[PDB]
From a paper:
These phosphorylation events are dependent on SR protein (SRPK) and cdc2-like kinase (CLK) families.
The main structural difference is a change in the relative orientation of the N- and C-terminal lobes such that CLK3 exhibits a more open conformation than CLK1. CLK3 also shows additional secondary structure elements at the N and C termini not observed in CLK1: first, a short hairpin comprising residues 136–145 that folds above the N-terminal domain; and second, an additional helical segment at the C terminus formed by residues 476–481. An additional hydrogen bond is formed in CLK1 between the A loop residue Tyr331 and His212 in αC. This interaction, however, is not conserved: in CLK3 it is replaced by a hydrophobic contact between the Tyr331-equivalent Phe326 and the αC residues Val204 and Lys207. Most notably, the alanine (uniquely replaced by valine in CLK3) that lies at the center of helix αG is packed against a strictly conserved tryptophan (CLK1, Trp419; CLK3, Trp414) located between the αH and the MAPK-like inserts. CLK3 is abundantly expressed in mature spermatozoa and might play a role in the fertilization process (Menegay et al., 1999). A greater role for CLK3 as a SR-specific protein kinase is also suggested by its stronger preference for arginine in P-1, whereas CLK1 shows no preference at this position. Overall, CLK1 appears more susceptible to inhibition than CLK3.
Numbering used by the authors: 136 to 303, 305 to 481
The structure:
Amino acid sequence: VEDDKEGHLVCRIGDWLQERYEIVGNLGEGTFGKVVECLDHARGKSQVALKIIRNVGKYREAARLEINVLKKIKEKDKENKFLCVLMSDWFNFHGHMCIAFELLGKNTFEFLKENNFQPYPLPHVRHMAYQLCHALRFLHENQLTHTDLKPENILFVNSEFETLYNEHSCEEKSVKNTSIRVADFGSATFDHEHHTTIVATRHYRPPEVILELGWAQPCDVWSIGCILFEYYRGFTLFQTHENREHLVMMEKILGPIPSHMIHRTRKQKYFYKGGLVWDENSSDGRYVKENCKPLKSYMLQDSLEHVQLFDLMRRMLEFDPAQRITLAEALLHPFFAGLTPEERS
């Protein structure tokens, strides 16, 4: 075996590792390494996703911590019922940390994109919501915060779809089975561990992160609220790439930022005399004026189930993380009364 000059293991479809794993496909990659589909010939050629981390110290050490998280999840979920992706193996292959997991279907972002960003139906949003709440409540009870929840990291167990229509327009598609798993625990942080200051992907990042006020489990709750909005409408709640504009959007959509948070933040440059600095009649001003309205305005129906969805989402999107709904509380929200018995377990 050998590495390339970037520290990737030099490998191709056709190659083996551990006299066990046969590489049969590529699943994706990034600056961390690569993920390949393999057949596990010690487990009857079952399919796995194998993450092969680069032979670079910072990525190796990060992967060690990822493995520790995945071990805890496995230790605590013996019936495999909390819907976190299941690690089947890990090893150090010539300095490359390798982590083997269950091979699942398309992620919920990919599926939305393939559906031309037409949203998921409400019962689908509801079942996925319930599942996210259940999975993360489990994580949260084990002193863990994911920190990078986003539709790309929520995977369908099976993403086979049914066609509703196919007019000679884009094909309107619905997933047949809305069972999901939470993936990518590479940023997950135990309560006692060092907390990276800026966590989450932009669109799913909460105000206490932006304002550098400290964060914990409520971070994930905010992300989930953002994700549900996106599943319900097909577009992101916060389409921005800059902190001040993001905070302004939060205020336009959700109401005023609590004064105590503004007094406490080291990010004073975004404020003046307690209010966000924002020129509302500038080009960006008009755009935020045009596109960012109060949260309830985005409802598509006035019916009870929609009203309930938006109440839960508002509670998930509370500015103050200490006021934000917990996932234990969320699981008891009336929105979930509309689940079926099959869905409800």
